[PDB]
Amino acid sequence: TVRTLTGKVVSDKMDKSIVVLIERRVQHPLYGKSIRRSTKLHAHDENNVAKIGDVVTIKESRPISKTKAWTLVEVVEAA
Amino acid sequence: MVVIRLARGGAKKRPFYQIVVTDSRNARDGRFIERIGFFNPTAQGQAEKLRLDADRFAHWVSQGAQPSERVASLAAQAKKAT
Amino acid sequence: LVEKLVAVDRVAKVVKGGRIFSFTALTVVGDGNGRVGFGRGKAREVPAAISKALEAARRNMITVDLAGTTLQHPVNARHGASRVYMQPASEGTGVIAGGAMRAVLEAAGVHNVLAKCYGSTNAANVVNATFKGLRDMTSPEKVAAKRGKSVEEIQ
Amino acid sequence: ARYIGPKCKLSRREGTDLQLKSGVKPFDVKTKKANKAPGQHGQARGGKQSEYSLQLREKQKVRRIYGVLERQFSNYYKEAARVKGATGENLLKLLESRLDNVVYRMGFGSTRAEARQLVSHRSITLNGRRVNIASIQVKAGDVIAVHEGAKQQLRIKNAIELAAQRGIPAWIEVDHSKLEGTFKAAPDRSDLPAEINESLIVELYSK
Amino acid sequence: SMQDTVADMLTRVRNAQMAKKQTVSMPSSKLKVAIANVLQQEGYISNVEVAQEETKSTLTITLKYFEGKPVIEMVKRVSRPGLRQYRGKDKLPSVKQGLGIAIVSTSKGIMTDRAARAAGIGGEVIAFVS
Amino acid sequence: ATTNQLIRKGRTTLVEKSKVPALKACPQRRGVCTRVYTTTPKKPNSAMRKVCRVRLTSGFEVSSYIGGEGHNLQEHSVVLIRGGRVKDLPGVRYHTVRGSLDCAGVKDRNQSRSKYGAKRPK
RNA sequence: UAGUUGGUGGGGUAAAGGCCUACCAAGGCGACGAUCUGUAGCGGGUCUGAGAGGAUGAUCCGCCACACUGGGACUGAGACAC
RNA sequence: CAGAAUAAGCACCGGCUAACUCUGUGCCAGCAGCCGCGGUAAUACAGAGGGUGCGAGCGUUAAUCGGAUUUACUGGGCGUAAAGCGUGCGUAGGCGGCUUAUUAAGUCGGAUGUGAAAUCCCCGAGCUUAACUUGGGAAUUGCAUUCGAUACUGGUGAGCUAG
Known part of the structure; x- marks a missing residue:
């Protein structure tokens, strides 16, 4: 039951890596308005299957580099 | 090692002990793993003197914990009581 | 009937040679069972002002x-x-x-x-x-x- | 501590008889100055008073009759507020349930002051214990008895004579020959006199 | 531009009541129809009609007056596009100590606060009426 | 403001400064008298009031009013000062406490003695 | 921001990892506040308040860092050791 | 066993604020949190009498919150009191007309795990009472996983004409 997060690829320049932008929607602690929030996560894709614009799913893993600790699972939607 | 012993509490001249399972390196009245009873040396009236949980006592003793001498004596007292 | 003197005040108007001074009174009157009213009364004397306020409050009731x-x-x-x-x-x-x-x-x-x-x-x-x-x-x-x-x- | 001072000055100031003179003569005959405050500027009771003034005089009136100082009175009020039910009535129940006041209402004390001294000198016993605190609250079912040393006392004999002259309250039942009585429950508000007003005190503390 | 049709409908009802008119007409939508049906079933308004010509539908509401006064004394919009209000079952609002109604959008449909409490569900608070 | 405006920027709260900066959040302060003088109150009051210039341990030279009928303070006197405002002498924001390190209580007083430091006469 | 961001071979650690190193590529972060600068041990709790909130971290408990100032290792299950 | 024998002070009395008079003194001495009092009949200055409120304590200074809806989420304002940019265009952002199918992100409901102990509150027990100590419960208003609902908001496909 690995934790899974779905996002969309935003970069593919690096070798065997992709960068995916993940967005969440939460209420403001004081005023209650629903507001947008986003985070950028580095992932590992050995075969360079994913590219910029596609929707992907990633899971948590052991560290693979200084900044990468997530791995590709499937390409949900091809660009 | 893991031990079962008495942590002090209450007021001056009238201590009240918690029977706790803890790592021997922790302080007497500090960090502990589990609380499994109490001991009131000067109980009077309706106050209960000794309450020890035999199931947890046996479990921890089986897991390698070493009781102190006072706790062993109290466990013997509780065994006689029940 | 319950009668209460909410307030009393001293007021003035300017005229040649000095000031004319008067008093005003705000009062409330009720029964305590659910009927109440309030009134205002003005006069050169506090006793008169209070009485006029009492009559006004009596008239204005709900x-x-x-x-x-x-x-x-x-x-x-x-x-x-x-x-x-x-x-x-x-x-x-x-x-x-x-x-x-x-x-x-x-x-x-x-x-x-x-x-x-x-x-x-x-x-x-x-x-x-x-x-x-x-x-x-x-x-x-x-x-x-x-x-x-x-x-x-x-x- | 305790308030040691003239009683009739305070009684006249309060404007009503506080019942601190044992009632052997009429209070009016004893003081012959009621309706006039003690002092150079003492004026008749008909003088107007402020709202805060009345609120304060009510608390002072209760405190003077029951011999309780301000700190203990405030603790009593906070306790009544915590307790469920009408806070004002609970406060009066708390005052009535005092050991020395219960001894007075049970009839072995000529005055509440005398009952205080009896308790302090250990001439009274709660159940089988020689208590010496007047602030003790007497719970339901308690037995206020006299001590052996206290028995065979001229003061106690005169006190029981005065109690017989008086009327014993219903909730207490005391055998004078055995010099011991028992407490059923807290006297009800209807039983308590209607002269005292508690709402003024509740607002005083609420402010 | 127009951005809150529910607020517009509530405002039209309020101003018609204040001007003492017997009927009020407006462009129709299914959400407005649901709100009007809830008001009618709670007794604030008499009748609700929808009339379609080619593709445009008009909602018509009949208004009630009692003792020479509007039946709807107070109507307020709670959740707006700028700020959206969602409440759980425990924290549902009460209007005038239960003498009014709070209209609630829940997964089971549009209902009042007391009915939502009975069902044990929450949702979006739309309006207060009394 | 609107909800969006409040989200983008919040509500601003403004702090308040201390009316007694010389004390530096202390109930009292030791000092050394630098000059004892008598000044004239501002209108409409007319009188002569005794003030002193003090170098505090904190480091701020300050003016201290002296209360009571009689004062024996002179140059090079170690005194103790506290908060308090005369309300009619500009620039005076402190009092000197009597009965302190070098100050003495006021003689021939029997009312409000705890103030002015006079001890109990028999 | 130039070991900087990622990859391959090798080194190293009880253990993942630019942790180190040779080469390869030009990446990586930032208006959702990067970089710089000021201030500060953090939580359970405590005070105030109808509540929302505001102020706060003595005494009790958990975690962190430090031992005249700075740089180091040794021994040992465990220290870079009042 | 001895005997009332060993034991009560501090602040205040013009309004806010419960308690007033005499004397001495006079725009001096002085009092003063604010409005204020003081040039010979000051209940506001010093003493005295009498009182008022506390009490082994009573006053002052220092500091935080409250009153303060004077930072307003709950819960404020911009014609003349403080406050609409000299006027447009437009980027990021915020919000956005009607119908229908699908999704279940927001939203809502259920279950499991977790939210240490102490502290707060509730019912009891031991302290002559109370403080205090203590047994149990509640609470910890949150976080995570999972299974469900589809009215509203958002995503997707399709259709429409009042913008």
Whole structure:
């Protein structure tokens, strides 16, 4: 039951890596308005299957580099 | 090692002990793993003197914990009581 | 009948050679069972002003629908720059309010309420605001009647 | 501590008889100055008073009759507020349930002050214990008895004579020959006199 | 531009009541129809009609007066596009100590606060009426 | 403001400064008298009031009013000062406490003695 | 921001990892506040308040860092050791 | 066993604020949190009498919150009191007309795990009472996983004409 997060690829320049932008929607602690929030996560894709614009799913893993600790699972939607 | 012993509490001249399972390196009245009873040396009236949980006592003793001498004596007292 | 002297004040007008000085009085009169009124009276003497205020308050009266010794629902009222909030309270709380609001509430007959004043605390305006709020309070029976439903259905 | 001072000055100031003179003569005959305050500027009771003034005089009136200082009175009021039910009535129940006041209402003390001294000197016993605190609250079912040393006392004999002259309250039942009585429950508000007003005190503390 | 049709409908009802008119007409939508049906079933308004010509539908509401006064004394919009209000079952609002109604959008449909409490569900608070 | 405006920027709260900066959040302060003088109150009051210039341990030279009928303070006197405003002498924001390190209580007083430091006369 | 961001071979650690190193590529972060600068041990709790909130971290408990100032290792299950 | 024998001070009395008079003194001495009092009949200055409120304590200074709806989420304002940019266009952002199908992100409901102990509150027990100590419960208003609902908001496909 690995934790899974779905996002969309935003970069593919690096070798065997992709960068995916993940967005969440939460209420403001004081005023209650629903507001947008986003985070950028580095992932590992050995075969360079994913590219910029596609929707992907990633899971948590052991560290693979200084900044990468997530791995590709499937390409949900091809660009 | 893991031990079962008495942590002090209450007021001056009238201590009240918690029977706790803890790592021997922790302080007497500090960090502990589990609380499994109490001991009131000067109980009077309706106050209960000794309450020890035999199931947890046996479990921890089986897991390698070493009781102190006072706790062993109290466990013997509780065994006689029940 | 319960009679309360909310306030008395000294006022002046300018004339040749000096000042003409008079007194004004604000008073409230009620029965304690749910009828209340307030009035103002002016005169060159306090005894006369108070009496005129008493007559004015007697003339200006209304009826109020109470819930035992408390209000039917929380109420917000205003007159000019004076705002008043009143909330029903459980038995034993008492009347937690200011003097101006307390006079009107005692005259009406409410003995359990929590009241707050926001804005100007002018005695006459606060009395007017409390008066209008108490007058405009509704009741479960009236709400059911105007909705066309039963009181039990209204709950 | 305790308030040691003239009693009739305070009684006249309060405007009503506080019942601190044992009632052997009429209070009016004893003081012959009621309705006039003690002082150079003492004025008749008809003088007007402020709202805060009345609120304060009510608390002072209760405190003077029951011999309780301000700190203990405030603790009593806070306790009554915590306790469920009408806070004003609970406060009066708390005052009535005092060991020395219960001894007075049970009839072995000529005055509440005398009962205080009896308790302090250990001439009274709660159940089988030689208590010496007047602030003790007597719970339901308690037995206020006299001590052997306290028995065979001329003061106690005169006190029981005065009690017989008086009327024993219903909730207490005391055998004078055995010099011991028992407490059923807290006297009800209806039983308590209607002269005292508690709402003024509740507002005083609420302010 | 127009951005809150529910608020527009509530405002039209309020101003018609204040002007003492017997009927009020407006462009129709299914959400407005649901709100009007809830008001009618709670007794604030008499009748609700929808009339379609080619593709445009008009909602018509009949208003009630009692004792020479509007039956709807107070109507307020709670949740707006700028700020959206969602409440759980425990924290549902009460209007005038239960003498009014709070209209609630829940997964089971549009209902009042007391009915929502009975069902043990929450949702979006739309309006207060009394 | 609107909800969006409040989200983008919040509500601003402004702090308040201390009316007694010389004390530096202390109930009292030791000092050394630098000059004892008598000044004239501002209108409409007319009188002569005794003030002193003091170098505090904190480091701020300050003016201290002296209360009571009689004062024996002179140059090079170690005194103790506290908060308090005369309300009619500009620039005076402190009092000197009597009965302190070098100050003495006021003689021939029997009312409000705890103030002015006079001890109990028999 | 130029070991900087990622990859391959090798080194190293009880253990993942630019942790180190040779080469390869030009990446990586930032208006959702990067970089710089000021201030500060953090939580359970405590005070105040109808509540929302505001102020706060003595005494009790958990975690962190430090031992005249700075740089180091040794021994040992465990220290870079009042 | 001895005997009332060993034991009560501090502040205040013009209004806010419960308690007033005499003397001495006079725009001096002085009092003063604010409005203020003081040039010979000052209940506001010093003493005295009498009182008032506390009490082994009573006053002052220092500091935080409250009153303060004077930072307003709950819960404020911009014609003349403080406050609409000299006027447009437009980027990021916020919000956005009607119908229908699908999704279940927001939203809502259920279950499991977790939210240490102490502290707060509730019912009891031991302290002559109370403080205090203590047994149990509630609470910890949150976070995570999972299974469900589809009215509203958002995503997707399709259709429409009042913008």
